[PDB]
Design a protein around this ligand. Structure first.
Ligand SMILES: CC(C)=CCC/C(C)=C(/F)COP(=O)(O)OP(=O)(O)O
Ligand SMILES: CC(C)=CCC/C(C)=C(/F)COP(=O)(O)OP(=O)(O)O
Ligand SMILES: CC[N+](C)(C)CCCS(=O)(=O)[O-]
Ligand SMILES: CC[N+](C)(C)CCCS(=O)(=O)[O-]
Ligand SMILES: CCC(CO)(CO)CO
Ligand SMILES: CCC(CO)(CO)CO
Ligand SMILES: [Mg+2]
Ligand SMILES: [Mg+2]
Ligand SMILES: [Mg+2]
Ligand SMILES: [Mg+2]
Lengths: 305, 305
């Protein structure tokens, strides 16, 4: 009952997905993002912790909880925006990235983000933290740009450079406890793996959340952007999206086999290489987990806040 | 403290590994393969259910138990043999593959194998069962050949065509509940993945169990075979094994990216493709799990039976 894609990794879900949902809902209620039983029941119908459970299929305990909480927080933060007021709010979210931030008195979404960032950043290196602050800041401030406000090219550039995927890619390293070695992070090979994971997930979500977004008047969807730019039919635009998804998947799987030799040329110790391979497995899991979750979730029936 | 290899997959262990050991030991005791507390304590020191726990890192319940029990049975069966008496015994093991077999009165090793096979075969297709019977029969009867009795080439051929890996490859499909689609099983691509998994695991085990096998006077090890054939040093032979291991690993990861396009050319439905991708993930987990387990297990200190 949905568009189907050939994503060449197995479907997997964390064995502790059920308990993870209870803990995640409890966090959402404690942070004031879900209020009352009716909202909670509506929210649970989305399987909202299952997206984290699929991305992070072997995480346990606080690592799993962080992975699940990021996505639930995203749903709440994203739906909050549905320019002066936006800038004031978003600048408070960005302020929670400061190591000395005090969340007292902030809006609940920003108190929650402060909690997420503290848990996400604490075990990671200064190198990871620098780029993670940049990636979070871009995702957050992009809401201001949205309020002030594309071609197909503009949309694709905006999604990959200022969307939610750059933070989610950094999160993979945290939840898997597998930071990518700095000397390989900037290589064309790893940047390609990151970029193709970024766009694959963006556009698989666009295809699978299309009916929801149309129903809500939400224009930020590649399929709608293609149609508007090219005056193409719905099927034409969906087929264009499909070809793009398939090309990114193909680029990912053709690129991964280069990594061991690359690590050898860079003199990376073997234990550090296993960190890289673990992050890349996390990318595989994210690509497949995004597809399986977007395909199954009631969020995309086409409100708990 | 051991030879190290670049195996480009993450290290993973089933979250239920601890309970899995208790259940596996109880099975070994119920089948008469472990007798007494001393033997049990010695056996546990090997982390004997941990090899199944690494191969099958998401399996649960009876699927996980089967995966762990296979390896424990292998240790006991393989250590039973360390030609007329061998043939009489092995022929009883092969007879347990027949659906009409009665295990009553058989040797405990054969009663146990009968139990394993009933559990392994029950959910599998007749096509899988025919080739699984063949692979088991070749592994079992090869003990007769060993009793009657190589060049490097002969050894390598014997290990991959009649050793324990062909049954373990079939077991991957069972434990993951992911049968390889019949039309793709015989393709050069899938046969290459099976062959490289086969040889990689064989020779990684030879390198990492070498000292144990030398201490026991066991000559069935590629490193010893190379030295004997070439009159080469220990380091020379280990370096040869290393080059072979690396080449099989490289062949595996260069071949996997061909599978989606192959499935397209063969007209394989997408759900069947995900079965293939799952079995291939099982091969990745086996390659890495074998390396990690052989590196950590006290079985390789250099007896519970
Ligand atoms: C599936 C998921 C939670 C995240 C991965 C995709 C992604 C990068 C988003 F920003 C969510 O897409 P969108 O902003 O379109 O949100 P929607 O309303 O489709 O859930
Ligand atoms: C590690 C494991 C159980 C299996 C993978 C290797 C393999 C295919 C074997 F047949 C082990 O044979 P061998 O008789 O050399 O096993 P050992 O005596 O070294 O434990
Ligand atoms: C043995 C398995 N244990 C440790 C109990 C799993 C706990 C998983 S958790 O922390 O996500 O609930
Ligand atoms: C919720 C997690 N459960 C299903 C209880 C794990 C049981 C794993 S098992 O069957 O291997 O013990
Ligand atoms: C809806 C299916 C399709 C358009 O007909 C788009 O994915 C197939 O190419
Ligand atoms: C013992 C290491 C080595 C021989 O010196 C074999 O793996 C390195 O090539
Ligand atoms: Mg949205
Ligand atoms: Mg969407
Ligand atoms: Mg042996
Ligand atoms: Mg050995």
């Amino acid at each position: 009952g949905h568009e189907e894609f050939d994503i060449p990794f197995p479907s997997r879900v964390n064995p502790f997905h059920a308990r993870a949902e209870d803990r995640h809902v409890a966090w959402m209620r404690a942070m004031g993002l879900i209020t009352g039983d009716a909202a909670e029941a509506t929210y649970r119908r989305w399987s909202p912790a299952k997206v984290g459970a699929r991305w992070f299929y072997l995480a346990q305990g606080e690592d799993l909880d962080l992975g699940c909480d990021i996505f639930g927080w995203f749903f709440a933060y994203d739906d909050h925006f549905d320019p002066r007021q936006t800038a004031a709010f978003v600048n408070r979210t960005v302020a929670m990235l400061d190591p000395r931030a005090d969340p007292t008195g902030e809006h609940p979404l920003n108190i929650a983000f402060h909690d997420l960032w503290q848990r996400e950043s604490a075990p990671m290196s200064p190198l990871w933290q620098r780029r993670a602050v940049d990636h979070w800041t871009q995702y957050l401030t992009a809401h201001i740009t949205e309020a002030t406000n594309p071609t197909i090219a503009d949309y694709l550039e905006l999604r990959h450079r200022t969307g939610f995927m750059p933070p989610l890619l950094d999160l993979i390293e945290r939840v898997w406890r597998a930071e990518i070695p700095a000397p390989v992070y900037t290589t064309p090979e790893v940047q390609t793996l990151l970029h193709t994971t970024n766009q694959n997930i963006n556009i698989v979500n666009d295809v699978l959340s299309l009916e929801k977004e149309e129903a809500h008047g939400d224009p930020h969807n590649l399929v709608l952007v293609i149609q508007h730019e090219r005056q193409s039919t719905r099927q034409q635009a969906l087929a264009t999206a499909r070809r793009m998804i398939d090309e990114w998947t193909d680029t990912f799987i053709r690129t991964e086999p280069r990594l061991p030799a690359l690590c050898g040329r860079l003199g990376i110790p073997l234990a550090d290489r296993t960190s890289l391979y673990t992050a890349v497995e996390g990318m595989r899991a994210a690509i497949r987990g995004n597809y399986d979750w977007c395909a199954e979730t009631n969020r995309y029936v086409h409100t708990p806040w």
